[PDB]
PDB file of C-alpha atoms in Angstrom:
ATOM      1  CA  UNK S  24      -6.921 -14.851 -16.916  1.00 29.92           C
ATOM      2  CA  UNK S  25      -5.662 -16.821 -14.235  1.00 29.04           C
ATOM      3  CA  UNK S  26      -6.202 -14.161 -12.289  1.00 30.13           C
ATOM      4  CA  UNK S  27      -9.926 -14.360 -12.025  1.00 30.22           C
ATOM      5  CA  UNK S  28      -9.865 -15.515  -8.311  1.00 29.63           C
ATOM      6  CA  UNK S  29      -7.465 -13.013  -6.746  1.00 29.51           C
ATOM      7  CA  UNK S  30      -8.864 -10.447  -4.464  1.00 29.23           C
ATOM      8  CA  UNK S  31      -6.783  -7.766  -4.211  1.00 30.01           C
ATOM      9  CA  UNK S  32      -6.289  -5.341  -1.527  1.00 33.54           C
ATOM     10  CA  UNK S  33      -4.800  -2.217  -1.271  1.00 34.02           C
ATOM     11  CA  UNK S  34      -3.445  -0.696   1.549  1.00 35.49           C
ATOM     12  CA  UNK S  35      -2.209   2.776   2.333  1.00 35.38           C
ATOM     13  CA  UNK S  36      -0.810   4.771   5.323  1.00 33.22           C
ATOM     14  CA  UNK S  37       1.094   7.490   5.720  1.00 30.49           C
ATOM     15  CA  UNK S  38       3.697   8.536   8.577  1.00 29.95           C
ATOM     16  CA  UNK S  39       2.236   7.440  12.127  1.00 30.90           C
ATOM     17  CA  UNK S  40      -0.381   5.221  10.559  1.00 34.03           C
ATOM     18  CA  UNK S  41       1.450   1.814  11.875  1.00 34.45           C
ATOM     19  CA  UNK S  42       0.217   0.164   8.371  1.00 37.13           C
ATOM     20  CA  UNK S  43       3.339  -1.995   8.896  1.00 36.02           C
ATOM     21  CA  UNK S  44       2.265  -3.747  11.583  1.00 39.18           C
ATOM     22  CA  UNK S  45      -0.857  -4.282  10.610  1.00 40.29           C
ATOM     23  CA  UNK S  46      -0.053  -5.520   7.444  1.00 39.25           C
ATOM     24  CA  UNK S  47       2.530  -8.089   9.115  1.00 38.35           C
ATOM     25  CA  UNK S  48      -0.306  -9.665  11.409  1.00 40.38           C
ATOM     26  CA  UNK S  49      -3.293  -9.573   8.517  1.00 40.73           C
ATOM     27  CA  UNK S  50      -0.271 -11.799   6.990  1.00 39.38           C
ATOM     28  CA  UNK S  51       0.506 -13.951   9.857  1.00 38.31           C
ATOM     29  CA  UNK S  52      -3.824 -14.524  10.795  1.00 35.95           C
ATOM     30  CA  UNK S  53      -5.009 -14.888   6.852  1.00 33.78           C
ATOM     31  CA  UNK S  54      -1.806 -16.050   4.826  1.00 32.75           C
ATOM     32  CA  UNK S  55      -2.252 -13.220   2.601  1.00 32.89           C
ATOM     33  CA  UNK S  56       0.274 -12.834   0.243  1.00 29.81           C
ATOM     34  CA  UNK S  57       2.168  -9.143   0.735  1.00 29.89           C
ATOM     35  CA  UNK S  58       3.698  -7.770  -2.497  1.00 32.16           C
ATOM     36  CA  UNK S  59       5.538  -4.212  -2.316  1.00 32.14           C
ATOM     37  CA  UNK S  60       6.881  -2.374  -5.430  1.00 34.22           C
ATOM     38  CA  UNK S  61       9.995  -1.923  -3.390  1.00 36.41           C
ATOM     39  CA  UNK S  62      10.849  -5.882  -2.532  1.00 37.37           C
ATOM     40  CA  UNK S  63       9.728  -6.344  -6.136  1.00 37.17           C
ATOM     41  CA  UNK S  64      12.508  -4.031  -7.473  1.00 36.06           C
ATOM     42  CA  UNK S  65      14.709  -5.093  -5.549  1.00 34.73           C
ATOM     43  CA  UNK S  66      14.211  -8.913  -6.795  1.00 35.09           C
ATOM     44  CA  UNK S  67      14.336  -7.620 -10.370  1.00 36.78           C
ATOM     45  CA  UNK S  68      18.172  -6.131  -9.625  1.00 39.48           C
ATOM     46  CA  UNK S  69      19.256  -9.549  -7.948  1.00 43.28           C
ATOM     47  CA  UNK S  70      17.577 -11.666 -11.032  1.00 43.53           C
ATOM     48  CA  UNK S  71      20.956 -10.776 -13.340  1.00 45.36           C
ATOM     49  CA  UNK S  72      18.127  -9.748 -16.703  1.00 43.96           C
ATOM     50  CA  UNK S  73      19.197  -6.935 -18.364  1.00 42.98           C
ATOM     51  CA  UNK S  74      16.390  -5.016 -17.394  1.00 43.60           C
ATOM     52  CA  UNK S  75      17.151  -5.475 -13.877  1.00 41.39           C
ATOM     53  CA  UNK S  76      21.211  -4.263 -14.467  1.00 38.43           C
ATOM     54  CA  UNK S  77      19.009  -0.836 -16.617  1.00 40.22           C
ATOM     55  CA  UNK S  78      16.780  -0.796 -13.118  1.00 41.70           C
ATOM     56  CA  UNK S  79      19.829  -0.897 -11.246  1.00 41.27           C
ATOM     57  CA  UNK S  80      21.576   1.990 -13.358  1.00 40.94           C
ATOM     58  CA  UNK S  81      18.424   4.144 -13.139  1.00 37.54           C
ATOM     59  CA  UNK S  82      17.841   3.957  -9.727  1.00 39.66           C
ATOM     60  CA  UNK S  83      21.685   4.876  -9.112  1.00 38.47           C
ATOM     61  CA  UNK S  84      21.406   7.794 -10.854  1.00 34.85           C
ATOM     62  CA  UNK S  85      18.110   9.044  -9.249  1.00 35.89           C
ATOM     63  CA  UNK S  86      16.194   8.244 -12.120  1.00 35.40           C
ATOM     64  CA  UNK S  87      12.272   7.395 -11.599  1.00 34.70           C
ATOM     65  CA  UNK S  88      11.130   3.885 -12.335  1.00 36.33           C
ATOM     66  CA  UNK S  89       8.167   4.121 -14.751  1.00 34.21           C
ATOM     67  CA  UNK S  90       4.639   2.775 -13.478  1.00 33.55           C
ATOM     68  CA  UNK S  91       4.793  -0.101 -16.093  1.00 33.73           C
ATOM     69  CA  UNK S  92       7.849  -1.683 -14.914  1.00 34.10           C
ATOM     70  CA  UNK S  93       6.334  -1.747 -11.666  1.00 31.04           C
ATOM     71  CA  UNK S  94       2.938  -2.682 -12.992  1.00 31.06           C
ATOM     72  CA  UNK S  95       4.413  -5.580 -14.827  1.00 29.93           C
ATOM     73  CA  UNK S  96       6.358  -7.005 -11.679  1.00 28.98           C
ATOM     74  CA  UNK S  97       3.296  -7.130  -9.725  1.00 29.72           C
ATOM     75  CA  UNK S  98       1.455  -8.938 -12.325  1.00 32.89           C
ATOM     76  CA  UNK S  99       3.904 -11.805 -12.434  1.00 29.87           C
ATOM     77  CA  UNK S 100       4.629 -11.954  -9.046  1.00 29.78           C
ATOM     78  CA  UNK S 101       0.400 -12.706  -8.713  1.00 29.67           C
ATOM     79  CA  UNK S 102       0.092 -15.006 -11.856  1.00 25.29           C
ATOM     80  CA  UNK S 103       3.066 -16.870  -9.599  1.00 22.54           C
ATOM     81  CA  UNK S 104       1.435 -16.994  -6.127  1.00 23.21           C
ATOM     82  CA  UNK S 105      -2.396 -16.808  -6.854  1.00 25.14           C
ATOM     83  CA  UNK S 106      -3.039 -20.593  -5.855  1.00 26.25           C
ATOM     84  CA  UNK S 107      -1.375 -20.308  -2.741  1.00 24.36           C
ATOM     85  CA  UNK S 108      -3.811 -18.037  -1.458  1.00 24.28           C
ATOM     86  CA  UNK S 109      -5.904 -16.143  -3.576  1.00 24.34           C
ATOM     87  CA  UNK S 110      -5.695 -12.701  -1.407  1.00 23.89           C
ATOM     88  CA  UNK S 111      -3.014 -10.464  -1.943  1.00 25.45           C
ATOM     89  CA  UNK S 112      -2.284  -7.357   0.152  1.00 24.82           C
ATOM     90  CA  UNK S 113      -0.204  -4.649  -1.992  1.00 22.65           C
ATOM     91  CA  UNK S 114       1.653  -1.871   0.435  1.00 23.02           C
ATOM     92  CA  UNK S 115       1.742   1.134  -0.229  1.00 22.79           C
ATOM     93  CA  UNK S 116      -0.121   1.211  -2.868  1.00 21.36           C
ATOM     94  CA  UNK S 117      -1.384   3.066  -4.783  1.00 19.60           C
ATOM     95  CA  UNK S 118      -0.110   5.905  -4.015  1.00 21.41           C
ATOM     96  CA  UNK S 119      -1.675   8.198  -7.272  1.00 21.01           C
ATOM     97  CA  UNK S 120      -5.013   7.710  -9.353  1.00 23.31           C
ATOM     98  CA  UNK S 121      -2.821   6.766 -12.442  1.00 24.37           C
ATOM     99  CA  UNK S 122      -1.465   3.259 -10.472  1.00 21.99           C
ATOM    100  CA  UNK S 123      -4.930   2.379  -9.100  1.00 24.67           C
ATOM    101  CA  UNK S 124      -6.470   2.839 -12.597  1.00 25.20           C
ATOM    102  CA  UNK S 125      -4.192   1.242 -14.837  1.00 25.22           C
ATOM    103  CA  UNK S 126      -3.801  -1.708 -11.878  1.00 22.05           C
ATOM    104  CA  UNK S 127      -7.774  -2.767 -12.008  1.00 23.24           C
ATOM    105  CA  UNK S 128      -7.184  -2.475 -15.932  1.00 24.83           C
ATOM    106  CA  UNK S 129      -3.853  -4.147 -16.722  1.00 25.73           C
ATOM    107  CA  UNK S 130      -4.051  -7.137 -13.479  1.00 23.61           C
ATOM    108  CA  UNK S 131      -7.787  -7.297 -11.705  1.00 24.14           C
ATOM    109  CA  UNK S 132      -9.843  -4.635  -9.826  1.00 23.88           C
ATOM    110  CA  UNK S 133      -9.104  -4.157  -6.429  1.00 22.73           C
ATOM    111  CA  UNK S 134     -11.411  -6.264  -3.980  1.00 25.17           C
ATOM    112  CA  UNK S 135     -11.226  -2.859  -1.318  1.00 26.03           C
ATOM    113  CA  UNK S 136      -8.705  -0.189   0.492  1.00 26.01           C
ATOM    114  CA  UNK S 137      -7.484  -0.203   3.780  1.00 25.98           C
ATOM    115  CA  UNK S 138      -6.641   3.132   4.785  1.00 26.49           C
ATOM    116  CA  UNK S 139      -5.161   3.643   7.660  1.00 28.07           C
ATOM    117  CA  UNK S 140      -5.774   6.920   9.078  1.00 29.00           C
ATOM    118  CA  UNK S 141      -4.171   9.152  11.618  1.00 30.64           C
ATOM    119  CA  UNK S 142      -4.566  13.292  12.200  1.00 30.12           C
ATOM    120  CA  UNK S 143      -1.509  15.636  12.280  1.00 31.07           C
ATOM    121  CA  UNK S 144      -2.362  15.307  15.764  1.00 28.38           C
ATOM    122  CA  UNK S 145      -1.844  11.800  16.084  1.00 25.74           C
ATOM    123  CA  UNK S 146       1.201  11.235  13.997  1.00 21.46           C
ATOM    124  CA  UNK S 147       3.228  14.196  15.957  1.00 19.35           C
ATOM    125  CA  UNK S 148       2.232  12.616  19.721  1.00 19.84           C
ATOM    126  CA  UNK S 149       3.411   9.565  18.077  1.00 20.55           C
ATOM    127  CA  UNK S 150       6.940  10.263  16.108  1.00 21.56           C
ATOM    128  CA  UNK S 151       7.672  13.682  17.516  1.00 23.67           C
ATOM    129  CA  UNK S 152       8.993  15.248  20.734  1.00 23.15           C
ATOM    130  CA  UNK S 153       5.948  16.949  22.828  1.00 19.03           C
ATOM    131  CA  UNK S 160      15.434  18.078  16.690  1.00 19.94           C
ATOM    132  CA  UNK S 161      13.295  20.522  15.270  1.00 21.95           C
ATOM    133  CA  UNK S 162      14.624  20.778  11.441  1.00 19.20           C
ATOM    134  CA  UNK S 163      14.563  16.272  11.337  1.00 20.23           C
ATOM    135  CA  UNK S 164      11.096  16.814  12.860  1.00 18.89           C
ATOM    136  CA  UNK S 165       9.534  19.346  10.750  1.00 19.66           C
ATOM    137  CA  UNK S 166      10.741  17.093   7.354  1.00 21.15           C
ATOM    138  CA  UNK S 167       8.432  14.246   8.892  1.00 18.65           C
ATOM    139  CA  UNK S 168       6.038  16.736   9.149  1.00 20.20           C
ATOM    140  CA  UNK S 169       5.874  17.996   5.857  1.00 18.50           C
ATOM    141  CA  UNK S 170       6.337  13.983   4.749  1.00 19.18           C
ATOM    142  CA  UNK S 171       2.874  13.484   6.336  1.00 15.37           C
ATOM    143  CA  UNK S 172       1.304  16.362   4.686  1.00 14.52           C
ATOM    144  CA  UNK S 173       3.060  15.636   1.041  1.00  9.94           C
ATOM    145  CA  UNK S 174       1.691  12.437   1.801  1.00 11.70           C
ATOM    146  CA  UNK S 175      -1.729  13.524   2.497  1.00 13.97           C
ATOM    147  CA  UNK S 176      -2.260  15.621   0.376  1.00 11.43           C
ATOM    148  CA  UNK S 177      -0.808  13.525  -2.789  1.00 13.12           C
ATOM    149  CA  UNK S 178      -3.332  10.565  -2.072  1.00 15.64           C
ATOM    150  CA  UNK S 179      -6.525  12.438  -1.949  1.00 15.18           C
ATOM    151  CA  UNK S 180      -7.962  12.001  -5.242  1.00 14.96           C
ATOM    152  CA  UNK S 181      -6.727   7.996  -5.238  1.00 16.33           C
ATOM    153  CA  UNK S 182      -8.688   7.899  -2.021  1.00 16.61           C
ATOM    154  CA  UNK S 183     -11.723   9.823  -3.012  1.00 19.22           C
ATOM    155  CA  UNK S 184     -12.148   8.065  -6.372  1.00 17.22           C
ATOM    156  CA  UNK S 185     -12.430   4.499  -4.202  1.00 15.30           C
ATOM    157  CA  UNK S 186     -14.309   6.253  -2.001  1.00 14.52           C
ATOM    158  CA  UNK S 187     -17.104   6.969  -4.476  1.00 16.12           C
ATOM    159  CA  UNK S 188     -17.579   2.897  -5.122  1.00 17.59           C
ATOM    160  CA  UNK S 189     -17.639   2.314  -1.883  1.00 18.50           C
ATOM    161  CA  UNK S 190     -14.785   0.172  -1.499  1.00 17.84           C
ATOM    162  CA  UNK S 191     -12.474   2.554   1.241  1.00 16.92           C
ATOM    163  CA  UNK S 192     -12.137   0.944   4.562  1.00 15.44           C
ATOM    164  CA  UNK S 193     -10.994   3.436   6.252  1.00 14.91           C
ATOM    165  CA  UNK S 194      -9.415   2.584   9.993  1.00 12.51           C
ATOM    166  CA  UNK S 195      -8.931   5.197  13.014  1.00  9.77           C
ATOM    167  CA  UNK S 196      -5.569   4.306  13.683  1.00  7.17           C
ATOM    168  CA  UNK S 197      -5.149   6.871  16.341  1.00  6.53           C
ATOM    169  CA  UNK S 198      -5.874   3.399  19.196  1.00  5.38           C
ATOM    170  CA  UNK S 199      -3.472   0.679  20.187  1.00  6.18           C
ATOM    171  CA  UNK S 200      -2.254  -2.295  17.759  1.00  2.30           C
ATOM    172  CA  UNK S 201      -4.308  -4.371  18.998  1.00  4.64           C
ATOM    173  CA  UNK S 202      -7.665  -2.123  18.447  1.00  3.34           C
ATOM    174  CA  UNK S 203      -6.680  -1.259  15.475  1.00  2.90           C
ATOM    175  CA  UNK S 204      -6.239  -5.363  14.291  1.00  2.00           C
ATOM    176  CA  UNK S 205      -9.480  -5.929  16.061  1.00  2.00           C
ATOM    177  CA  UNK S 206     -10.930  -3.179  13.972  1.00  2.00           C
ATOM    178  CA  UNK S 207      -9.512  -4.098  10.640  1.00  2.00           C
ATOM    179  CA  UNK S 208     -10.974  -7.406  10.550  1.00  2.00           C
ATOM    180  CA  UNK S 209     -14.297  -6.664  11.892  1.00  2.00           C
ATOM    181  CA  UNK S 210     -14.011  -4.237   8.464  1.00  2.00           C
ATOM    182  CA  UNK S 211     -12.805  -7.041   6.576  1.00  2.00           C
ATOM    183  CA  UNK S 212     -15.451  -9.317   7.111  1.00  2.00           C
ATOM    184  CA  UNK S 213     -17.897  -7.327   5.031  1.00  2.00           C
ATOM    185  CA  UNK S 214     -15.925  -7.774   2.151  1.00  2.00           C
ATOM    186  CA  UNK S 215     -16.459 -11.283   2.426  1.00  2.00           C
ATOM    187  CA  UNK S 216     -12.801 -12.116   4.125  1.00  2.00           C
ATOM    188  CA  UNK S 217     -12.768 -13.973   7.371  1.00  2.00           C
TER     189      UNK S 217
END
């Protein structure tokens, strides 16, 4: 494949985790490409393809958008950008075992996953008042959230390739942190 020089990185964060911003200045210091399912979709409606116009009438009626679709827009959008820069940072993603899998199967294994940490704690001192029915829904967003990616992040876990970042300090900590992690994976 001509994907045989990508390194691939994952990234994942919750609410409160800030994996935004860090994913905007990783960008702006290493020229990583930065591929979402959700700008890829959203390309995919404004190509005019059939498939994009059956996207677009799917995701009006509420309808999920299957893994491969998704799968398959990621792939081309790498086979189009891999000799620009070889790195690619994926956000928000994945999100379930059954996306990582398939990914490092269908595309190229990942080359590690950032993951972006915060506590209950942190995330409420953070978004919350110190609008209780508005605040309580981001609450049980983090947990949902938490709770849904713990087998993804246990499973990359077990091959050592987790980097996982206390994101509980300031942007600029965190950044600091991120690459210092980064480095061992052989990106500098």
């Amino acid at each position: 494949q001509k994907l045989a020089k990508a390194k691939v990185i994952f990234v994942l964060g919750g609410p409160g985790s800030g994996k935004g911003t860090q994913c905007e200045k990783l960008v702006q210091k290493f020229h990583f490409n930065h591929l979402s399912s959700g700008d890829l979709l959203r390309a995919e409606v404004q190509s005019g393809s059939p498939k994009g116009k059956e996207l677009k009438a799917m995701m009006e009626r509420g309808e999920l958008v299957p893994l491969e679709v998704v799968l398959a827009l990621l792939k081309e959008a790498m086979i189009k950008l891999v000799d620009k820069n070889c790195h690619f940072l994926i956000d928000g993603y994945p999100r379930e075992l059954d996306q990582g899998i398939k990914f490092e199967k269908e595309v190229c294994p990942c080359l590690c996953v950032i993951n972006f940490d915060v506590s209950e704690e942190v995330m409420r001192k953070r978004l919350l008042k110190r609008v209780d029915d508005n605040e309580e829904t981001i609450v049980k967003r983090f947990r949902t959230f938490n709770e849904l990616t713990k087998p993804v992040i246990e499973h990359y876990k077990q091959q050592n390739k987790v980097i996982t970042i206390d994101a509980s300090g300031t942007v600029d900590a965190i950044f600091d942190k991120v690459n210092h992690e980064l480095q061992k994976f052989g990106v500098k």
